[PDB]
Amino acid sequence: MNPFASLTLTTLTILTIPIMMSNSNIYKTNLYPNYVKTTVSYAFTLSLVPLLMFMHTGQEMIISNWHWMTLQTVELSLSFKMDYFSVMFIPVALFVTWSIMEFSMWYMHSDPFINRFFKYLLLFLITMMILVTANNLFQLFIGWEGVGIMSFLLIGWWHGRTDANTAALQAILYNRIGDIGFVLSMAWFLTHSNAWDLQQIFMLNNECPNMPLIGLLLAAAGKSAQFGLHPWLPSAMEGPTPVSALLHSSTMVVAGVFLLIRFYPLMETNKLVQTMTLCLGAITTLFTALCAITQNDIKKIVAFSTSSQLGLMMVTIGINQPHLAFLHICMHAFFKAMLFMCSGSIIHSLNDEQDIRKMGGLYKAMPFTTTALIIGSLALTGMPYLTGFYSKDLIIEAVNMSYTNAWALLMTLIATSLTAAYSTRIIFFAFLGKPRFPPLVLINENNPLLINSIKRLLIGSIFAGFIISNNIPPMTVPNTTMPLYMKMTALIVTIMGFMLALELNNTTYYLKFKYPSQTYKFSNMLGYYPSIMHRLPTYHNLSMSQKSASSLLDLIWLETILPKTTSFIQMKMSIMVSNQKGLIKLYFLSFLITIMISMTLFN
Amino acid sequence: MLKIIIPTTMLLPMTWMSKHNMIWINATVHSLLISLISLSLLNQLGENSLNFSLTFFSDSLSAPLLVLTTWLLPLMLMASQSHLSKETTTRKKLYITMLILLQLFLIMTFTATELILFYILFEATLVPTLIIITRWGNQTERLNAGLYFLFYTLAGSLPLLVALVYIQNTTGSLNFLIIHYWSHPLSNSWSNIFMWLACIMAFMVKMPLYGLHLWLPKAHVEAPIAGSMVLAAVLLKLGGYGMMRITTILNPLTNYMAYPFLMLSMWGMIMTSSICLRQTDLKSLIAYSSVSHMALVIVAIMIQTPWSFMGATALMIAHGLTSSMLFCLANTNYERVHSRTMILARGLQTLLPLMATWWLVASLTNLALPPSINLIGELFIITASFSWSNITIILMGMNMMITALYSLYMLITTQRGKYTHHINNIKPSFTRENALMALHILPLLLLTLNPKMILGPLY
Amino acid sequence: SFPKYKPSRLATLPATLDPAEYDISPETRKAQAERLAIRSRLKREYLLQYNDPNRLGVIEDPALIRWTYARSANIYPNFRPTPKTSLLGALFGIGPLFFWYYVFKTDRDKKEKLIQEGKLDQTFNISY
Amino acid sequence: HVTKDMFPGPYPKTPEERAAAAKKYNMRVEDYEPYPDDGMGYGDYPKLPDRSQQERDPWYDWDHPDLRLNWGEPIHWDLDMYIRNRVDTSPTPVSWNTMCKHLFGFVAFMLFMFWVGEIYPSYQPVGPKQYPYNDLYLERGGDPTKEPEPVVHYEI
């Protein structure tokens, strides 16, 4: 009865079977990656049904099957929430994961531990599913830590590389800084509303105070790589290309924005937190776009593009349009996964080369790859009637006509212009000029796995925006009437960015040379943020850890106070008392003295 | 209870009349059998207790600690089976005798319906530990470590005896049931302040509190493996158990006498977590981690709220199991390397993959990862302290971040990277070590399914 | 003319911009020769101990043992109470404790005063 | 298997003592400089340059390639601080002072301009939104037994 609950639990259950089978015999063969890919595809095609039923009726449901434990008046149970957000984000994540796994079956064919890689990917997918479908804050925290741990394990895939371990530890550090605010919010909610369940939290908090919302915003900033804690996302590219294509591109990094979306009934009631998150989104999108303008590593450019999109949806949350932010999450998944898959194809075809200085004429050498990358870039920049349009155009329109901060407006407009600019930079520097790779041409894409994985996301990034936009009930008040000049501001600014970037990139052909300006050095070195913030704090803290805490206090003064002073005093007293020459003259003189003292004192 | 105490006593004649080549088998089998018998005690009721007789009673606070104590001994035997290969039969039998005596004293301690009997066994637990540390220790600093461990404990616990006999003289009984039922408020006076200090300091020194923790790194570093696990797992919980038992008569003085200890613990957790980052030794790093966790437990107990007590019990059990596992892994590394230095052996994951998996699981559990009971206790204490004051969250979050940092530093330095070239005696890991790690870790992931068994009487 | 690179503690002077190796004197060459000589002596000892087929253990490193002993077990015997050491110890071991005590005492006093006045709105605060 | 002499010793004022220590640490006598004789317990341990350990010659055939170390050479007091996994002092293309100045200026300017824009917000030439039933009084909070003051809307 009502297959909604049955299928919505069965998808998450069937995603777990290969993990159970990982100790079986199939794990020791080469059939495991295909097994995992088929399992993910079946889970996607099964979870596609609750989406249809929700679209037809508007079905919503929460399932609290297993009662974990009761703490006096609080009950913790394994509760899954299957609202619009969950039922819509399950198929997108499963589809992207299916394409990424099929791509990895070709990209990582030479890795001896490919089965372990696929098992790690499946574990990350399961944990993200748990995070998305969670109903109480404890289960959400379980997913929150699981995705972070899987990201740590997958960033440092190559244990020999020191930079991989450094990036993994850096990501864990920033995620724990966010978890500080997450735990603050959890504790506040339990101690004030007496429940970690979302229903009671929504009901009991008509006017949510500043502290829990600031904690939630800090957690979202930590995991979505906002300006305060951005560098971990660009640094997380030390892992294999499929990992950065699935985890740190479209699925794991949208966890903070999804957390902010989930608590939107409380966000609207507070005005200071909305302003703070809008400002954070604006500053971070501008900063990462500006950094991506002049980057030279392709994966770095796409990572900064991901960070900019994350900041854009944080801005969308700021102007109180959570559903639009969710829609942009859904579209960005598709086209950003496309872009990373194309970048991985180029990298593999060019013998593990990532610098765009060594990519030349690939428009004709790799026709399917360049057409996929062109479609993805045009969708990203906001070309009308594409997947990115249905989200970004509405984002900009809603942002332009709200009683918001003006500096955020200007920053968002400059950010989208710079987005167009760096898309132009990627295309021009990797597909237009004369070839610059080593003479031994090893270009080859004629592999069915790569072609099929790219074409599925191609059909997606072409039609899914239209399908999803026209197949869901309305949840926001439309902006029907708008000034014509402001109606086209997104297109005008994107075209201006295209023209400016192309004109400035064409000047590199001229046979003139000039040393860089201060602005170029600032933009290439990532605002000098990774340098200073990774040398000034850390060092100092570590210095104290050896100077004050370890040596000076523990090994010197704490030893001097209790044990050493006692030892010295007892040694001195023992030396004083036991040093008697053995003369009975002094003994009996002391006896006379004590006899006199007791005679005159104790009477 | 005698169904548990009597077999533990019979373990001694069983060991002493065993054949020269079968002591380990018999000791392990019968220790495991004893643990199964101890499982029955776990079924506590929401009412008072399982008052067995006039001398022994069991609560839902004593049950998890008793089960852990009975479970630890087989693991101690399997850990000690390695370095005692070249030891004479009499000395091996003496070692097993010391371990059995320690278990018997702990079992009699944890129930101990009367406070003077509790104190007597609480100090009796000190002789076998000192003998183990100072006799079967490798380094030449084991003597100084034994002296520190003896005197730090005894100096704190000596005023406790005077306080207890004074309480018996005035109150008239030291039975814990009568003490709980007839409790009366403590007036704010200098005499009552010093009674509070005498009754508290004896348990705070053993936990240990920051500033009195100097004995713990020495005792943990210089002791053999079995002494290390019994110190980190059970002997640290004696102070917390005693404090949670004895804070029933110190109200309402504690309401303002907890400030120095609360501040000391909430700052020493940060200090020792930072110390763990810059460490050249593995066992010292694990010992300082234990100090940090016990400081958190001290904060929880001093807050004195139901969530504080539940989190304190959960953290006690979880930290015991995790620290025992970490000491096991460090000992397995040291046996092959013979150096006990973190950066001397590197990249061991390429050579020993399964031990790398065990290292990862132990570090994740120490990192307080959900839904493990480590994080259950951590989060309960965090919420209780937040209710106590909203500013504690800063210190607790800083501690959490530093804990993650040093845990992953310990994992990365010893497991990841390029292997050291001039070491060629890294033999494949035996079945004994893998079984030891599995038996350490599986109870944690099993207890995460039934948390109510380790949440204490205030559940 | 070009802007000068000013080194700092966390960004040291590059070897190329350093002027010590441009003012070369015969004693500097002698010093470099001795440095290379002792380094090569150590390298030869290590390689002789490293390629030995009979060796089946870990090559003990005197430098590592010396470093560990200096870091851990040689701090107190070389410690002397001086105004700098005493001031640093008092500050770093006392100031944070009293700072946090004052902060928490003030917060709890404010909370208790609000409770006594009753203007705190403690509704639904069941768990504590 | 190490003699007592090999172990670290207290700071020595005399040149002969200094020479003995420099030879012990496997370094030149005039290349050896102990930490200043302060209260801190450095004692007789060479004060190697604070130069990091990431920027050692990456092409030399080190005995420990990952740490960039040689067997037997003196070890920096703060090696665990500089292991290429932590703070490194590699020279940077831009000076440290100018880097700090530029970053602080950018952040402060951004914050100031965000505050300025908050002072002067941006909106549209429209009036407040109008909701039918007493500004949706029943649907926001409820309290139906209070009969709120009824707000009427002006058709224009």
Ligand SMILES: CCCCCCCCCCCCCCCCCC(=O)OC[C@H](COP(=O)([O-])OCC(O)COP(=O)([O-])OC[C@@H](COC(=O)CCCCCCCCCCCCCCCCC)OC(=O)CCCCCCCCCCCCCCCCC)OC(=O)CCCCCCCCCCCCCCCCC
């Ligand atoms: C309502 C009316 C609507 C109309 C509005 C206006 C319409 C358009 C007007 C045009 C406006 C600007 C368009 C040109 C963009 C600049 C391009 C350029 O010339 O670059 C060459 C030139 C240097 O290039 P280079 O070193 O020779 O390159 C070496 C090779 O070429 C190596 O080359 P490569 O191959 O390695 O890579 C080349 C790469 C490398 O290029 C770069 O170096 C990146 C630097 C350029 C980014 C600047 C663009 C936006 C800046 C936003 C700043 C936010 C506030 C930050 C505040 C900082 C305060 C310190 O360049 C590119 O790929 C493309 C560049 C981006 C162009 C496309 C997007 C720009 C259009 C959007 C901006 C305005 C339209 C807004 C639309 C919305 C309507 C309002 O750039 C500059 O000279 C900088 C110009 C602007 C910098 C402003 C910041 C000055 C701050 C000084 C201190 C102020 C006092 C602070 C006091 C603080 C107290 C606390």
Ligand SMILES: CCCCCCCCCCCCCCCCC[C@@H](O)O[C@H](CO[C@H](O)CCCCCCCCCCCCCCC)COP(=O)(O)OCC[N+](C)(C)C
């Ligand atoms: C399909 C079934 C699934 C569930 C199976 C569960 C099996 C559980 C087995 C494990 C039991 C754990 C031990 C429990 C010990 C605590 C209880 C014990 O103390 O009770 C004693 C009784 O214990 C039993 O008599 C003996 C049980 C010991 C053996 C347990 C089964 C497994 C033993 C395995 C040993 C090794 C097997 C062979 C290996 C080669 C004394 O009872 P008593 O205080 O008088 O009772 C008074 C109340 N009365 C009057 C109503 C009775």
Ligand SMILES: CCCCCCCCCCCCCCCCC[C@@H](O)O[C@H](CO[C@H](O)CCCCCCCCCCCCCCC)COP(=O)(O)OCC[N+](C)(C)C
């Ligand atoms: C070092 C590592 C840690 C070791 C353990 C540290 C914990 C020990 C600290 C002791 C806790 C507090 C002790 C006394 C608390 C009472 C409150 C008192 O201190 O405050 C004022 C008391 O005034 C003064 O403090 C009087 C005492 C001054 C003398 C005590 C020594 C102070 C410094 C010594 C520090 C040494 C500690 C370590 C010793 C080895 C309030 O004045 P008043 O309201 O009128 O009296 C309140 C008591 N009444 C109500 C019963 C009358």
Ligand SMILES: CCCCCCCC/C=C\CCCCCCCC(=O)O[C@H](COC(=O)CCCCCCC/C=C/CCCCCCCC)COP(=O)(O)OCCN
């Ligand atoms: C690791 C080292 C730790 C050392 C711990 C030592 C300090 C422990 C705290 C003080 C211990 C002694 C307390 C006495 C035992 C309690 C007995 C009691 O409460 O009776 C009081 C008696 O109180 C006392 O006599 C206390 C006198 C204390 C003398 C010994 C001083 C020891 C050191 C004092 C300062 C230490 C406090 C901080 C120690 C921190 C740890 C170093 C009631 O007196 P009545 O006769 O009944 O009066 C009723 C009629 N009006």
